Amino acid sequence: ILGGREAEAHARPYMASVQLNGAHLCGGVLVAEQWVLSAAHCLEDAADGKVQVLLGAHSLSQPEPSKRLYDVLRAVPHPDSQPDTIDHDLLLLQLSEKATLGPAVRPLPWQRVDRDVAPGTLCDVAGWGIVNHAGRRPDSLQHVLLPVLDRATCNRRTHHDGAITERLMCAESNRRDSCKGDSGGPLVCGGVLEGVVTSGSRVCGNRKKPGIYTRVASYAAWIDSVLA
Numbered sequence: 762i763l764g765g766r767e768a769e770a771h772a773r774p775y776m777a778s779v780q781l782n783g784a785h786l787c788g789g790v791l792v793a794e795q796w797v798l799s800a801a802h803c804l805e806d807a808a809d810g811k812v813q814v815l816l817g818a819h820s821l822s823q824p825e826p827s828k829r830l831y832d833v834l835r836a837v838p839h840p841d842s843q844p845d846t847i848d849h850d851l852l853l854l855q856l857s858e859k860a861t862l863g864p865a866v867r868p869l870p871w872q873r874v875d876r877d878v879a880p881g882t883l884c885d886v887a888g889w890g891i892v893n894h895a896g897r898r899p900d901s902l903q904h905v906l907l908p909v910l911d912r913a914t915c916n917r918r919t920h921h922d923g924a925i926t927e928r929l930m931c932a933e934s935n936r937r938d939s940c941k942g943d944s945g946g947p948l949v950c951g952g953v954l955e956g957v958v959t960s961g962s963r964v965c966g967n968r969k970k971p972g973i974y975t976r977v978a979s980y981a982a983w984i985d986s987v988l989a
């Protein structure tokens with residue numbers, strides 16, 4: 762997260778770190794007792810690798826009573842996802858067992874009504890992704906508030922130009938933005954999950970290249986089907 766601030770410890774009980782061979786890779790969001798939602802491209806790079814999900818965490822490295830590492834029973838990438846498209850970029854991880862719920866570990870309700878978040882709405886994005894332009898990695902969860910940027914605008918030419926479908930939403934990236942390593946994590950507006958940070962490569966913190974977030978309401982049948 763660029764241009765943000767350290768998050769209040771455990772104030773986002775839904776926040777997950779998706780890890781590969783013991784290291785943070787991508788964010789993710791606890792959406793049911795046994796299921797974490799993240800981005801598919803994060804795990805394109807993976808089959809030779811143990812995937813785990815850290816819940817209840819603020820620090821990546823220090824112990825905390827609430828902090829618990831869960832093995833993964835199943836990774837389920839969206840069926841229409843492909844390398845080199847930003848579209849359908851979601852992944853569901855089934856935890857090995859139901860997460861132990863408490864004040865620090867709780868699922869986030871997510872948007873099921875397929876209507877865009879109004880332009881200018883301030884939404885919150887959190888992650889353990891890079892915090893500057895050098896590539897520095899924080900130990901502790903960071904977060905930033907970003908205004909949603911209308912789709913009509915996001916499709917303009919010196920922007921993202923053509924790609925942004927009805928299943929994607931955009932937010933401003935003017936010095937405050939999500940970046941590499943924040944992919945898969947939550948964009949939350951009025952306390953509901955609205956988007957998941959996309960995992961394509963892109964520059965961070967440049968006003969001319971807005972953040973892209975996959976709209977979870979667009980995918981509500983698929984998410985229901987997987988959990989069922």
Ligand SMILES: O=C(NCc1ccccc1)Nc1ccccc1C(=O)O
Pocket residue numbers: 785786787802803804806889890891898940941942943944959960961962
């Ligand atoms: O390499 C990644 N994380 C490494 C990291 C850890 C901590 C901070 C910063 C970076 N993640 C990805 C892997 C494949 C495709 C997309 C992404 C992605 O994050 O968009």
